Amino acid sequence: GSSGSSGWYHGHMSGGQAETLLQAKGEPWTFLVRESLSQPGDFVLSVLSDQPKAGPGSPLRVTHIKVMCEGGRYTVGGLETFDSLTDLVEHFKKTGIEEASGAFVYLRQPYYSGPSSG
Numbered sequence: 001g002s003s004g005s006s007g008w009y010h011g012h013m014s015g016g017q018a019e020t021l022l023q024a025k026g027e028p029w030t031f032l033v034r035e036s037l038s039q040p041g042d043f044v045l046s047v048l049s050d051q052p053k054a055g056p057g058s059p060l061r062v063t064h065i066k067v068m069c070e071g072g073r074y075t076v077g078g079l080e081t082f083d084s085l086t087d088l089v090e091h092f093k094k095t096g097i098e099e100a101s102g103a104f105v106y107l108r109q110p111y112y113s114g115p116s117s118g
Contacts, residue, residue: 008032
């Protein structure tokens with residue numbers, strides 16, 4: 001198929017992992033959906049920022065956007081909700097996300113990841 005169809009769901013990824021995974025790629029503005037192992041029922045949205053730690057040669061920080069699954073609806077803590085992570089991701093895929101540091105983030109492209117790592 002020319003294009004895909006929502007392929008960010010890595011099933012059940014580990015926060016710490018995603019960080020490394022996303023970093024492994026380095027792709028700036030890269031999000032991915034992963035089930036919260038620590039939080040059964042909820043989910044985490046790790047997005048790769050274009051903001052390095054040291055700069056050139058350093059890994060780009062990571063932002064974990066927790067997903068509050070309440071009332072059969074998902075929310076990142078905002079008034080807006082959703083039924084499926086798709087209607088959520090595809091939603092914030094444009095509006096983007098806002099960090100606490102005052103910086104904003106955007107889900108340019110999802111994380112496909114591969115089988116082998118190293």
